Amino acid sequence: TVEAKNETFAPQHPDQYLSWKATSEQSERVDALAEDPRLVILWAGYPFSRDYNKPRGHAFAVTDVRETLRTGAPKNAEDGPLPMACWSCKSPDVARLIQKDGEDGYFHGKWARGGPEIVNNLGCADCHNTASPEFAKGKPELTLSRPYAARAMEAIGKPFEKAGRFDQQSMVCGQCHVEYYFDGKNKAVKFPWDDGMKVENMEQYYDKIAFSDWTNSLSKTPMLKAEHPEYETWTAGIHGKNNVTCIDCHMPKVQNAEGKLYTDHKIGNPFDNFAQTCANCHTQDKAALQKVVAERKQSINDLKIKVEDQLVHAHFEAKAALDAGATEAEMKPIQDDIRHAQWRWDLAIASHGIHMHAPEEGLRMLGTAMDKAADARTKLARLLATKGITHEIQIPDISTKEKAQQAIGLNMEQIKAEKQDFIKTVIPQWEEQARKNGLLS
Amino acid sequence: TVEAKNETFAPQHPDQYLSWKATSEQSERVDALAEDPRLVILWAGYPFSRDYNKPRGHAFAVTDVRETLRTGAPKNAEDGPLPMACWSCKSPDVARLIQKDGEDGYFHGKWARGGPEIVNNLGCADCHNTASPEFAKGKPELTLSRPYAARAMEAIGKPFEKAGRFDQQSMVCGQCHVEYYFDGKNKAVKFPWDDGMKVENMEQYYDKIAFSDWTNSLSKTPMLKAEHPEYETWTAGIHGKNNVTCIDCHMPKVQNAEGKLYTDHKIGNPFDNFAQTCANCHTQDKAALQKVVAERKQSINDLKIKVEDQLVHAHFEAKAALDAGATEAEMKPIQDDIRHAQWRWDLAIASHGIHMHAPEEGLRMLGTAMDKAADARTKLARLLATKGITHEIQIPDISTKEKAQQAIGLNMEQIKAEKQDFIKTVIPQWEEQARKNGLLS
Numbered sequence A, B: 001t002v003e004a005k006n007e008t009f010a011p012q013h014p015d016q017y018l019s020w021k022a023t024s025e026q027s028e029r030v031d032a033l034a035e036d037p038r039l040v041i042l043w044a045g046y047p048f049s050r051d052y053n054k055p056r057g058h059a060f061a062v063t064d065v066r067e068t069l070r071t072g073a074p075k076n077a078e079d080g081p082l083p084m085a086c087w088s089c090k091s092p093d094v095a096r097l098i099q100k101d102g103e104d105g106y107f108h109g110k111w112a113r114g115g116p117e118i119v120n121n122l123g124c125a126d127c128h129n130t131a132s133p134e135f136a137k138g139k140p141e142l143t144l145s146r147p148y149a150a151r152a153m154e155a156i157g158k159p160f161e162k163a164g165r166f167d168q169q170s171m172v173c174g175q176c177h178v179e180y181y182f183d184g185k186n187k188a189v190k191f192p193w194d195d196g197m198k199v200e201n202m203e204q205y206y207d208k209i210a211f212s213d214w215t216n217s218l219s220k221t222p223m224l225k226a227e228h229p230e231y232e233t234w235t236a237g238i239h240g241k242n243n244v245t246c247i248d249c250h251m252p253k254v255q256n257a258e259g260k261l262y263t264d265h266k267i268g269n270p271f272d273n274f275a276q277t278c279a280n281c282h283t284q285d286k287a288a289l290q291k292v293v294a295e296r297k298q299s300i301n302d303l304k305i306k307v308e309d310q311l312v313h314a315h316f317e318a319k320a321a322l323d324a325g326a327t328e329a330e331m332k333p334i335q336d337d338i339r340h341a342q343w344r345w346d347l348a349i350a351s352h353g354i355h356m357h358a359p360e361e362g363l364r365m366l367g368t369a370m371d372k373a374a375d376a377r378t379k380l381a382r383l384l385a386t387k388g389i390t391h392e393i394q395i396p397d398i399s400t401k402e403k404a405q406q407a408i409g410l411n412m413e414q415i416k417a418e419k420q421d422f423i424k425t426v427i428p429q430w431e432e433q434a435r436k437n438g439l440l441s
């Protein structure tokens, strides 16, 4: 009953379909590791040290999860580093499978298993109850197609079905644009929102279940990874406090050539249509508003670099303490500090929109990260001294992405060669197979 | 021609006179050192470690400068810790003396010397050209009565006489509500704005002229003291960027009983008259806006305390290094870091309005302070280890103002008794001479 094949809806909804399809124009894929090699050190031991780009259009979600080095080059349906859950926020086929196989059945196994099943571009079924008679009549019928997201919204005291129109608008974005972790042996997507959506709430939450994402290979710290917390941070910011929704800025109401109103489905930079976005509410002109947002982006970027420099030193200083023979008991309180410092930093800046959505909250977060980075490095200086080291720990050359990846032991030549062979030969097999099974066009 | 006796104007300007006089109702004097005993440590060796209160009504400026422990108990016109310049932002008799004796004449000598001269409350001649025939007709004729403030406004490319009416309104407050230092032999008020008003600009400015306000007596760091930077920080925040003036919030247009509109001169908390302040521009209700401002206040306070705890440790750790025989050369880079860390912290939170005027900027500044505090403490830990110390440095009990003051070697019982006697006996003498000279009554 869930229709994952988006083009089904084109004749009935040409304004929404044509604009939805146009996210393919947002095609630039910017390498964030090249731009910030410190990230390779911070994420040492984790797939994000291999490959991390800025987001681009929705049209590319499927392509990009296939192509990222993070997903590797599985040789069969039970192989590869990552689980089925990596599909969850990329395609309406996820909705299709959850309905067919149930949530547990969908999450079981490896990402590689979903390859010939998850094939349509993030689309209509992700956000709309397309099976409602009202939808054909041109009403939105917004829904949460993801039960893990429905459960999260209830956990914050905001059940979707009791929510008004405007809260529901941001909630559909909130199915994917959130911080999450993989829960249980089968790695189900969960939002860590049980105690609240603030960095302090989530930190306490993860510590109480003793969860870690990975162990940093330099410091041996049990780490937490933050991912794109737009919902949580937008909530904290002044626009969210005034229930200015994701849609007010990213999906403005515009007019077709016949003067009819519709929701613009080309989801991108709100500044690209200032006249229909900020200008609905603000008297300031485009240049003046761009200048403010740019200033905040710079303030955040300057402070973020300072925190990351502290963390790079902390990881290498912990590596030096290990190399001088520090025991697990000696390392533990240091590693607790590093875990908390990096959690705070990563949640502060994992969203590329933080300087717009809640710049004051990103700044505050970075400040609390810096407090724990200070504690870690002071403990480490004292620990190193007990092992007879009283000099500054020198860092290897991390001036480019390539040097940093080399420095942490990654064989990037082999990694990329394996991935490129996977892209060359497996993806077409997946698509050929999906077409044979009627899942794709 | 400056008229420092404010009551002169009462019959011509009864609406402004009566509301100006009403700041006397804002009478609560809150002890900031009691609320945060860490301050006593950070300002060790400076008058601020003795006595520091939150501000109250303008009506109390002359009495508070007289009554603070900071000015002490001078025995004659050439005694006491502080110079004439401490009167500068308290009273229209400053304008009177500047015009009579010239600026250089005014600044010469000790605070004690101006006692029998600076006797009228902060008032009309501080902000108005009262000599103008237009003033008796009811036109404001705003003026800068302080030449150093006029110089500072020119330095930021905003000469007062070329400014529009609305720029001029906030400049009048920016005669006093600024960061300043004492320049040269005679200790003249100067605002450090030559290179701009950002924390980074002022930090570089003071470093280039190798200025310090005092040497912290625990760490022997040459320190910089920040004071109430409202003008600078208001300029950095979104309200300033939008030319919302100090007056828009703090001196709203109100109607008298006969329904005549005038500027309310009872300068206080804008939330006391929300209907004529925020509500002129905002649709949100009073409780909602209060909740937002309180939330930023707590955010800043939380982070401020983290930074302060780091600085308290740094000052004591530096004391331990010194006791362990650290050389001047060994201490120097640490002292640079402490000096910078505390400057950034002090400028961030020296203004009690920062959480309202520019919360993102106060937060940003505190993060940059934390970066330097961390550097200081890491270098300290290494230095201490070279002297055979590898344990954490224990801190004295500083859980109260009294304990903190005892710990830095203040004899508060004696300091307070000398002040009480100064207050009971010298101030009536000053007032007697002023009245005899027709300066007071």
Ligand code: HEC
Pocket (backbone or CB within 6 Å): A051, A052, A053, A054, A055, A056, A064, A065, A068, A070, A071, A082, A085, A086, A087, A088, A089, A175, A176, A177, A178, A180, A189, A228, A350, A351, A352
């Ligand atoms: C609960 C939602 C969610 C899940 C689970 C999720 N993602 Fe994403 N992903 C997003 C969102 C939202 C973006 C765009 C925002 C951003 O990248 O900052 C994104 C972007 C991406 C991108 C493009 C940017 C980049 O990093 O190169 C890739 C590739 C990606 N995800 C792969 C994965 C992989 C691999 C996993 C499993 C570890 C995963 N995703 C799990 C929501 C999710």
Ligand code: HEC
Pocket (backbone or CB within 6 Å): A006, A009, A010, A013, A016, A017, A020, A021, A122, A123, A124, A125, A126, A127, A128, A135, A138, A139, A140, A142, A165, A169, A172, A173, A247, A251, A261, A262, A263, A264, A265
């Ligand atoms: C990323 C989530 C998402 C995607 C995917 C999505 N929509 Fe929408 N859609 C929305 C939101 C949000 C609205 C605005 C609802 C409102 O006004 O309250 C909307 C509005 C609509 C409406 C109501 C008419 C209008 O324009 O206001 C229709 C019909 C529609 N979309 C069709 C489609 C079609 C066809 C597709 C597949 C090409 C699609 N949607 C994919 C989120 C989405």
Ligand code: HEC
Pocket (backbone or CB within 6 Å): A026, A054, A055, A056, A057, A058, A059, A060, A061, A062, A064, A065, A088, A089, A090, A091, A122, A126, A127, A172, A173, A174, A175, A176, A177, A246, A247, A250, A251, A267, A268, A269
């Ligand atoms: C089904 C999960 C999902 C849904 C729901 C979702 N997003 Fe996304 N979004 C993604 C992923 C994944 C990417 C990154 C795509 C890539 O890089 O290939 C992305 C990218 C973006 C970007 C970056 C676009 C660009 O060109 O750089 C923006 C902005 C965005 N989404 C906004 C929204 C808004 C607003 C909503 C709510 C109407 C929403 N998203 C709903 C998953 C989702």
Ligand code: HEC
Pocket (backbone or CB within 6 Å): A054, A055, A170, A173, A174, A177, A230, A231, A234, A235, A239, A240, A244, A245, A246, A247, A248, A249, A250, A269, A270, A271, A293, A294, A297, A351, A352, A353, A356, A357
């Ligand atoms: C008040 C207007 C506004 C609101 C509401 C809003 N956004 Fe944004 N968002 C922006 C602007 C503007 C940018 C780009 C900032 C820039 O140009 O530097 C941005 C950036 C982003 C990005 C980073 C993509 C990129 O690479 O630029 C994502 C993802 C995103 N928004 C998603 C969301 C989500 C999801 C919501 C709702 C939870 C939301 N936005 C609500 C205005 C808004």
Ligand code: HEC
Pocket (backbone or CB within 6 Å): A238, A239, A242, A244, A245, A248, A249, A270, A271, A277, A278, A279, A280, A281, A282, A289, A290, A292, A293, A356, A357, A359, B238, B282, B283, B284
């Ligand atoms: C649906 C109405 C609406 C939209 C659209 C809108 N804004 Fe706002 N904006 C507000 C409201 C409400 C406030 C809070 C201040 C107030 O009470 O007026 C605000 C506050 C702000 C502030 C001050 C707080 C902060 O975050 O620094 C900035 C800057 C700003 N907006 C920029 C933008 C930009 C840029 C856009 C376009 C990407 C935009 N706004 C679009 C309504 C809107």
Ligand code: HEC
Pocket (backbone or CB within 6 Å): B051, B052, B053, B054, B055, B056, B064, B065, B068, B070, B071, B082, B085, B086, B087, B088, B089, B175, B176, B177, B178, B180, B189, B228, B350, B351, B352
């Ligand atoms: C450039 C103007 C200016 C200068 C010069 C100045 N002050 Fe002030 N003073 C202010 C302002 C504005 C306030 C209220 C704001 C605040 O305290 O944060 C204030 C408040 C005070 C208070 C009441 C609050 C407190 O700290 O207990 C005292 C006492 C005081 N000043 C004493 C002094 C002393 C002593 C000097 C000489 C070292 C001095 N002032 C120099 C502007 C100035």
Ligand code: HEC
Pocket (backbone or CB within 6 Å): B006, B009, B010, B013, B016, B017, B020, B122, B123, B124, B125, B126, B127, B128, B135, B138, B139, B140, B142, B165, B169, B172, B173, B247, B251, B261, B262, B263, B264, B265
């Ligand atoms: C802290 C600075 C300051 C103080 C002290 C001060 N004024 Fe004012 N005054 C202002 C400002 C600002 C305005 C508004 C000017 C405008 O509207 O542009 C104003 C306006 C006025 C006006 C014009 C009419 C009106 O109500 O707007 C008169 C007359 C006046 N004040 C009289 C006085 C009197 C009399 C005193 C002494 C009892 C005094 N002021 C003290 C700053 C001050």
Ligand code: HEC
Pocket (backbone or CB within 6 Å): B026, B054, B055, B056, B057, B058, B059, B060, B061, B062, B064, B065, B088, B089, B090, B091, B122, B126, B127, B169, B172, B173, B174, B175, B176, B177, B246, B247, B250, B251, B267, B268, B269
């Ligand atoms: C002549 C110097 C001077 C001028 C001009 C001046 N201030 Fe003040 N202000 C002070 C001092 C000193 C205090 C602290 C008084 C005390 O605590 O005894 C103070 C206190 C205040 C307070 C705290 C009131 C309270 O009850 O806590 C506010 C608000 C304030 N000033 C605002 C303004 C505004 C707005 C203007 C411009 C109209 C400004 N002032 C003009 C020196 C000045």
Ligand code: HEC
Pocket (backbone or CB within 6 Å): B054, B055, B170, B173, B174, B177, B230, B231, B234, B239, B240, B244, B245, B246, B247, B248, B249, B250, B269, B270, B271, B293, B294, B297, B351, B352, B353, B356, B357
């Ligand atoms: C957009 C409104 C607005 C503007 C503009 C404004 N203020 Fe404020 N200011 C406030 C509010 C509201 C508070 C009290 C915050 C609170 O209650 O927590 C405050 C606090 C203060 C305080 C601290 C007083 C105290 O009681 O602790 C001072 C001093 C002050 N303002 C002076 C100024 C000066 C000088 C200017 C111009 C450079 C200015 N303000 C501009 C609204 C404003």
Ligand code: HEC
Pocket (backbone or CB within 6 Å): A238, A282, A283, B238, B239, B242, B244, B245, B248, B249, B270, B271, B277, B278, B279, B280, B281, B282, B289, B290, B292, B293, B359
């Ligand atoms: C002269 C008109 C005016 C006055 C009076 C005014 N504001 Fe604002 N306020 C603005 C403007 C303009 C913005 C920028 C957002 C926008 O474009 O609307 C803003 C933004 C804000 C913001 C969002 C920035 C932030 O800090 O997140 C808050 C909060 C706010 N105002 C609170 C208040 C409070 C509280 C008062 C009363 C003490 C107040 N303003 C009085 C015009 C005004």
Ligand SMILES: [Ca+2]
Pocket (backbone or CB within 6 Å): A054, A055, A056
């Ligand atoms: Ca992007």
Ligand SMILES: [Ca+2]
Pocket (backbone or CB within 6 Å): A179, A180, A181, A224, A225, A226, A227
């Ligand atoms: Ca996570």
Ligand SMILES: [Ca+2]
Pocket (backbone or CB within 6 Å): B054, B055, B056
């Ligand atoms: Ca006060």
Ligand SMILES: [Ca+2]
Pocket (backbone or CB within 6 Å): B179, B180, B181, B224, B225, B226, B227
């Ligand atoms: Ca100063």
